[PDB]
Amino acid sequence: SQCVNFTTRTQLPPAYTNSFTRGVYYPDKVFRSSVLHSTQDLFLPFFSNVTWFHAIKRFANPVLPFNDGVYFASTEKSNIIRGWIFGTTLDSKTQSLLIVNNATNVVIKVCEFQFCNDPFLGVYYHKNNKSWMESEFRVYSSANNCTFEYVSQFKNLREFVFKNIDGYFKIYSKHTPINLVRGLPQGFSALEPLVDLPIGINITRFQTLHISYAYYVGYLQPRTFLLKYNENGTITDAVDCALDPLSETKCTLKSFTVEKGIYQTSNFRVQPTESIVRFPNITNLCPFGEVFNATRFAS
Amino acid sequence: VYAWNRKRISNCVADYSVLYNSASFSTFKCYGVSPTKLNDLCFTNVYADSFVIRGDEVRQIAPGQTGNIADYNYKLPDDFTGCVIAWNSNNLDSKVGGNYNYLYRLFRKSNLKPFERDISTEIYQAGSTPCNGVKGFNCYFPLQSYGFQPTYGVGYQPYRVVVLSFELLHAPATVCGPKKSTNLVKNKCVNFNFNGLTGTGVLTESNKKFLPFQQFGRDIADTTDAVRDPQTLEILDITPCSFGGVSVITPGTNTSNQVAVLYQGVNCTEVSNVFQTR
Amino acid sequence: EIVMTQSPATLSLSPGERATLSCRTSQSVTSYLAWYQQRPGQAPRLLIYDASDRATGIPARFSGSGSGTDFTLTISNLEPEDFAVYYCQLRSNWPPITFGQGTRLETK
Amino acid sequence: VQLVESGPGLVKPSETLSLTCTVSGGSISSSSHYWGWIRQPPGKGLEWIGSIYYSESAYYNPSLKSRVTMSIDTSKNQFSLKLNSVTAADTAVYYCARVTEPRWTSCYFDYWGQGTLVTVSS
Ligand SMILES: *[C@@H]1O[C@H](CO)[C@@H](O)[C@H](O)[C@H]1NC(C)=O
Ligand SMILES: *[C@@H]1O[C@H](CO)[C@@H](O)[C@H](O)[C@H]1NC(C)=O
Ligand SMILES: *[C@@H]1O[C@H](CO)[C@@H](O)[C@H](O)[C@H]1NC(C)=O
Ligand SMILES: *[C@@H]1O[C@H](CO)[C@@H](O)[C@H](O)[C@H]1NC(C)=O
Ligand SMILES: *[C@@H]1O[C@H](CO)[C@@H](O)[C@H](O)[C@H]1NC(C)=O
Ligand SMILES: *[C@@H]1O[C@H](CO)[C@@H](O)[C@H](O)[C@H]1NC(C)=O
């Protein structure tokens, strides 16, 4: 569509919080039961710094790096956050992905999009119908050489995990009712997989898409996690080994409990600071100066 | 080859009988697998990597190989599982005046990782003075073209090489071979094959609450304990059929020649006087 | 364009000496080169291929310094009947089959 | 092997110059060799015109390609050349040679023919 230009553009300052113990999702689709299983993959380390903002002069959302994957949480009453855009240049030069969940369905398209400066999704209240109806969508100026397309058929916390690995963009999703008013809630809830897309593109930055009438972001890291599958197979709890020595012990014993005692955990090895090379400095100095610095040269 | 094409095959059935039974393939080498067995297996996905090389380079396309192609154009992992099929394409890829359309990478700072594709066209600096996009002293274009004319030796003639890499993950199998699926049998010992995953056991109705995305479960042994029938979305528990040591209770041969047989740990139904003890 | 430049236009040497003809390509690709000999009134004769390979029937006194960009044809012992015109020939992408300007070898 | 040229020694300007090279030491249907034509004006250097393969196709000079064509005849074991709109600059000796192109840039004329002198004048 045609981009809508805003003379005044602004972005609210970022805020910081603690991840507590969220970001856990099922690594695979292998059922299990009443077992403690260890898995090393990209996870949200517990109690990690979380960068969060508010989604409302045109207050435009910021472009955030993607790194190895992003854990994106949205606390809202109505579905304000609707989608995201992923890529490196976020222009027609390189393939860019766009995910959205409009009033109709979910649209996911990988194309050489030309994203607008201020992507706009606008809805108006239909007084006669007494229902809001979306009527404005100005996100990308152009979309050429599309590489993928797929269209689907008391606050709320919607958590999502986006992981670009092996050309596969894996999205895991979870939805919960949260009664907290502000701040990232402290609690445990596994994120079920939503869908994997073999897009096979490079992603380094992404931006959030809001509707016009809070959210938190964290970066996953390579970590080892001890997941406790209960009788029904739902992950009841998780332990981050490298969070702290105690968790390292817990992962050592494959238990959500360590009894009093001393356990050989790891092996500490220091490494040389530098290299030293010494020889018989000069056995004899080669007399090169006598040739070059000779006052007189021969014919 | 430097821009080797990749295709994904998923959610379908492929008859490989016609594949390895074709005589048009000069080289047909499977690593981790045999040509015949493909029809009796299922895989989550397949990747077909297609490209063109010369005959001499055919050997380079294999695990644990080194060379210009292997290092700079296309590298296979040491644990590669799949099949490589190379066939001459002289009649298709050779021009009388010279077929320069086929290219290959000749220089690179480092060797390629497995299944890594590099299509960059940046000048390769091979000398002290850097190259600002201009060739010259120790400044070469990274790509070079094949001759591909009919008057070459077999080692220089074009060969089309396709590598089919089959992904055997825990995710649901989506690529299967031919072979119809027989009806489901329960409460009996059987050789079952669910989605290419083969085994032997007794299949029974299961009360386990499989999640929609979950196909099968594993026990502490990582062994298939329960499965989801691909046709009917139902959970079936698989249990070991029946095995036990056969011993012989025999009085001294000097005494008598009659003996009894003890099947250890088997019910008196899977097998005169029959006595069921613990 | 890959332009061929031979040197020198005329070479004045007497029998018993050794001659060195130079055939440098433009600042461009590098690969193989062919050297040919042509006497007056005769079709050119193939001397060297693949930048140093004596053709079938070429004496050992002919040799080629097959190296980068610049090439060199060397005649160890000039015989009386070795004074003729020498052409170097390449086969690039475009133009295909370029010929050198030729070096005239005469008896000083 | 041997190659022998044949054709009129005179061609009027702005007319087609036809030549035919007949070989007899081998076979033109061999899939290891090209058959080319190389001309040189009197007192000038060599100029490769075009090379033909046995099947049908050929490649020519990037300057004479418009007014040049080549043909082959395996049955008679000979290959011919047509140079349309011959100007006075085509006055030259034309040889037909045997070409061996094994790798990429290795392209040498193994055995040459004696060649025929075609002088184009009115
Ligand atoms: C998050 O980072 C900010 C500054 O980057 C720091 O002040 C804050 O303490 C960090 N959060 C935690 C939980 O340490
Ligand atoms: C789209 O692809 C075509 C052919 O593949 C190419 O010519 C064109 O440049 C591509 N689009 C852009 C914006 O580059
Ligand atoms: C398992 O699921 C069933 C049905 O959904 C439920 O009745 C039961 O309480 C669950 N048990 C556990 C341990 O989650
Ligand atoms: C030559 O002499 C100058 C001073 O006279 C000195 O600086 C220089 O190092 C000498 N060169 C060498 C090669 O020692
Ligand atoms: C068999 O056993 C009986 C008694 O146990 C003994 O008298 C007899 O000698 C035995 N026979 C042999 C061959 O040992
Ligand atoms: C053997 O099978 C029958 C019927 O399935 C069962 O009643 C019996 O208990 C089984 N044997 C044992 C030792 O449990």
Author numbering:
A (entry chain A): 13 to 68, 77 to 173, 186 to 245, 261 to 346
B (entry chain C): 347 to 617, 637 to 643
C (entry chain K): 1 to 108
D (entry chain J): 2 to 123
Give the article text.
We determined structures for Beta-6 and Beta-54 of the widely used IgVH4-39 gene family. Beta-6 perches atop the right shoulder of the RBD, with principal contacts contributed by the HC (520 Å2), while the LC makes very few contacts (124 Å2), limited to LC CDR3 (L3). The interaction area is relatively small, with interactions heavily focused around residue Tyr-501 with the three HC CDRs (H1-3) wrapping around the right shoulder. To investigate IgVH4-39 antibody binding in the context of the complete S trimer, the Beta S/Beta-6 Fab complex structure was determined by cryo-EM, which showed attachment in a standard way with 2 RBDs in the up configuration; however, all three RBDs bear bound Fabs. In summary, the recurrent use of IgVH4-39 appears to signal a frequent public binding mode targeting residue Tyr-501, despite the mAbs harboring a wide range of different IgVL gene families.
